[PDB]
Every structure is written in structure tokens, then in C-alpha cells.
């Protein structure tokens, strides 16, 4: 059934005595009902949103439009130049070319894809480049910066980003997408409602949500026009034909509030977002991604950012160790103590990324296919912990004591991937 893609390396699919498909993991020396090319099964007592999610993922992963093309595509980038390099290496390929397998090589394969997407998304989605901006100084979720156009070629960078966000969706790669909730709606062509103004502009939100319930006349006077702050100057725009003249009162409020919202959030970044989806669409057909609601899309693009320690521990394979050895117990102790960031950096070190599937660590992806997080007995005491980002394994030496283990484990993650 290779309309869903061919199996991962070391996988066989046989039939039960009654022709009920099951699979063989030549790697794990095990077998399962779950297709490794599809999200893992859901255990009973699991929220509908999650079961329904695994369901829509298969739907979305079966359509001809989401099918890898024969051959491969090469992306040569340098790590300190990942952004400008990726831009060139990618905006020069057509959409069809961009659908082949990804062979990414940092100057000087499969598991490099995770590390590639995780890292590039850090760059694009950084408010540094003026492409995006933190909505507030509080929430570190981002949204399109309307001032992006100070750079004449800025609509290109968006098309590139859209290609990339779509490419990560297309090739099953997670992104550090911390978007505002309203952006995912726009990616699904769902209308944006006044609720969205909360995550965008928490200030104007509470204001707009006051003129709908409370009094208006003799309290505030305005028209169907707004003020656009761009670069120290301001420009009044009509929210509708002849807006700067049509006043607003307790009898208008439904309109203005419903025109301002659509302006500040959507229209104001019409060009930027128009281009973005133009690129996201070269890969992910609009009429396909719309199988998801705003939440599911956000999860599809970006996976689960918050690592669950107890699920991680429950789904770690051991090699040369028992689940009750001093080093292992100690290892999980370090994790417990560590904040999320300290954990994410460790995962970023071992797997290549800090994102995790909605199915949790049960279905943690490697380069080839399914690969559970693995801790193996290897290396000497004075040796730093090592990793193979394609295998999800960490050769953890059997350190003699705690304080010495937690030391070498730190400089390994602090120096290799010093986030």
C-alpha cells in the first residue's frame, strides 16, 4: 500500500492467520499492529482531540498531493549561515523539485532534517530580522511584523518562510513555530474573530470588548477609520468605503468592532501573509490542510514543545543498562531538576530537535522511521556523553558518582548545542 509511502529501514509487514495486517520491527526484534509510517495507536482514555488528530493525520498523509517524489533534493547550508543559505538553496528549486527526499548537509542525512528545520525556524521566526515580532513583551509567541516592508525584498523572505513551514509539514519535520492562535486560522482561511485580538494586541482587545456591552455615546467618538503606525509616521485608513466620515455609536458597535479586528489582524499584513501562503501552498494544497482546525494545524506544524518527563522515562529503551542502575536513575534525576529549556537542549542534542509528536515519546521519530529515545552503556568515565542524532541514542558512560556525571553531561549539551 505504497500510496502512503514505503516502509522504514528494517521493517516487514505480514498478515495474521486471518489477514489482519501487522508489522515486524527488524530493529526492535518486535512486532506491532501500528504502521510505522503512520502515527502510533491511541490508548483508551485519550481525549477526542487527540484520537481525532491521529485520524486526520492519516487522511492527510494518504492524498496523492502529500506524496514524496522519486529521487532526492540536496540542501547545502552552513550552520552560522543557515538562514541566508537556506534562502538561496530553496528559493531556487521549483515546488516539484522541493517534494523529493531531503538530503541536507551542513558544510564541513535523514536525521539532519530534524536539526535543520528546528534550527532554521529559530532564525526565520526571530523578531530580529523584522519578519516577525513578539506580539507582547510577555508572551514569546510571534506574529507578522507589519513593519517588515522597510526591507524592499521582504515579501520574498515570507514566500521562502512559507515554503519552509510547508516543507516541514510536507517532509514530516517540526518547526519552532510559536505562532499566535490567529495565524493558524488564517492558514486555514477561517474567519478571524474579536477573540483573536487577545493574543495579538491584549490591550486593544479589552477596549474593543467594552464597546460591545457597555455604553458608548458621550463616552467615545470615532469613525470607520483607523490609524496605522509605521516608522514614526501615521496614516488613517478607511475600514470600509467612505469610513472616515461614518461615525460610530452604541448603534454601530457591531460593525466597527468587526471591521477593526479584520483590519489590525488580517488586512494590515495582507501583502506579507499573501506571499507567505503563496509559498506554503506551493507544497501543501490549501484544500488539504483545511481538514484540521486551528489547533490541530498548530500541532501539525510544530509538535509538542513542552517535554513530559514521565512519558519520556516511560518510553526510553536501554542498552547495556537496567532501568534501575545508578547512572540511569541519576540521569532521570538530572532531568527532573532541569527546567524545560535545559531538557529541550538535551533533546536537541540527542535527537536534533526539542519538538515531540502529539502521541508523545511513544512515537518519537528518528531519521529512518520509529526510533525510541535510547540510553546505552558506552564510553569511559572521563568521556563526555555522545549522541547519534539519527538513532536517538546517547552513549552514557557508567560514571562512578552523581556530581561527576551531571558535570560531563552538562558541558556536552552546553558546548555542543549552546542555546
Amino acid at each position: 500500500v505504497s500510496q502512503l509511502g514505503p516502509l522504514p529501514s528494517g521493517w516487514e509487514m505480514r498478515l495474521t492467520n486471518t489477514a489482519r495486517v501487522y508489522f515486524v520491527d527488524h530493529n526492535t526484534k518486535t512486532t506491532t499492529w501500528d504502521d510505522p509510517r503512520l502515527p502510533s495507536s491511541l490508548d483508551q482514555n485519550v481525549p477526542q482531540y487527540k484520537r481525532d488528530f491521529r485520524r486526520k493525520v492519516i487522511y492527510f498523509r494518504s492524498q496523492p498531493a502529500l506524496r514524496i517524489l522519486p529521487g532526492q533534493l540536496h540542501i547545502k547550508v552552513r550552520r552560522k549561515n543557515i538562514f541566508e543559505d537556506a534562502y538561496q538553496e530553496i528559493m531556487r528549486q521549483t515546488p516539484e523539485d522541493l517534494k523529493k527526499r531531503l538530503m541536507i548537509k551542513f558544510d564541513g542525512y535523514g536525521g539532519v532534517s530534524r536539526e535543520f528545520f528546528f534550527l532554521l525556524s529559530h532564525e526565520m521566526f526571530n523578531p530580529f530580522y523584522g519578519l516577525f515580532e513578539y506580539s507582547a513583551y510577555d508572551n514569546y509567541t510571534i506574529q507578522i511584523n507589519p513593519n517588515s516592508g522597510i526591507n524592499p525584498e521582504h515579501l520574498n523572505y515570507f514566500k521562502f518562510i512559507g515554503r519552509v513551514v510547508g516543507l516541514g509539514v510536507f517532509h514530516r519535520r517540526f518547526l519552532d513555530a510559536f505562532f499566535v492562535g490567529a495565524l493558524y486560522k488564517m492558514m486555514l482561511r477561517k474567519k478571524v474573530v474579536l477573540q483573536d485580538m487577545e493574543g495579538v494586541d491584549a490591550e486593544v482587545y479589552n477596549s474593543l470588548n467594552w464597546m460591545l456591552e457597555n455604553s458608548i455615546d458621550g463616552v467615545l467618538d470615532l469613525t470607520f477609520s483607523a490609524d496605522d503606525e509605521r516608522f514614526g509616521e501615521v496614516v488613517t485608513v478607511d475600514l470600509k468605503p467612505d469610513g472616515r466620515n461614518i461615525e460610530v455609536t452604541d448603534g454601530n458597535k457591531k460593525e466597527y468592532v468587526e471591521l477593526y479586528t479584520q483590519w489590525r489582524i488580517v488586512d494590515r499584513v495582507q501583502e506579507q501573509f499573501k506571499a507567505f501562503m503563496d509559498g506554503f501552498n506551493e507544497l501543501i494544497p490549501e484544500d488539504l490542510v483545511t481538514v484540521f482546525d486551528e489547533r490541530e494545524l498548530e500541532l501539525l506544524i510544530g509538535g509538542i514543545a513542552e517535554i513530559d518527563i514521565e512519558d519520556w522515562k516511560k518510553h526510553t529503551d536501554y542498552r547495556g543498562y537496567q532501568e534501575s542502575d545508578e547512572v540511569i536513575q541519576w540521569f532521570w534525576k538530572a532531568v527532573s531538576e532541569w527546567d524545560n529549556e535545559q531538557r529541550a537542549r538535551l533533546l536537541q542534542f540527542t535527537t536534533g530537535t526539542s519538538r515531540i509528536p502529539v502521541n508523545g515519546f511513544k512515537d518519537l521519530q528518528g531519521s529512518d522511521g520509529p526510533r525510541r529515545f535510547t540510553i546505552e552503556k558506552a564510553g569511559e568515565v572521563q568521556q563526555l556523553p555522545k549522541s547519534h542524532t539519527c538513532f536517538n541514542r546517547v552513549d552514557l558512560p557508567q560514571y562512578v558518582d552523581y556530581d561527576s556525571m551531571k558535570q560531563k553531561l552538562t558541558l556536552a549539551v552546553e558546548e555542543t548545542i549552546g542555546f
Binding site: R14, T16, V24, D25, T28, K29, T30, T31, W33
Partner: peptide
Amino acid sequence: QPPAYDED
């Protein structure tokens, strides 16, 4: 459980 990994 399905056929436990056996022969190779």
C-alpha cells in the same frame, strides 16, 4: 499481542 518476534 501479534506474532512475537521469532525466526529471522
